[PDB]
Design a protein around this nucleic acid. Sequence first.
RNA 1: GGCAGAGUCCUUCGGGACAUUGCACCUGCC
Length: 101
Amino acid sequence: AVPETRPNHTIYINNLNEKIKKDELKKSLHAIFSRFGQILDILVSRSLKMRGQAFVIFKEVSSATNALRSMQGFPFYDKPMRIQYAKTDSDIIAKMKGTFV
RNA sequence: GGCAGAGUCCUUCGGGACAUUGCACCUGCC
């Protein structure tokens, strides 16, 4: 395939298991991604489109670049999964730039 | 303030049938 591949603040992971809880999927993303840097927050949805994926916000855009080079296609919930950068930024960073100026 | 969806619809929100390897940061009842 031909993925544009672009750097962003939040990364989107897909191809996950379809039987994870909300406190269990958010606790695993904060333990691995935090090892690289400090995480701000993690959101997980269980809708049809979101039936196996999550989003993590890194303190800086560089913190997500390293989390993808080492976690590119790694095991998360008893299964292999590839990570692709997110398409847009996170709404929490909208005010982190400086109380929305 | 309880609770689910965040996938569609009947709807008194009480319950109920049926689909999805797919870029989200959100609403409603009382």
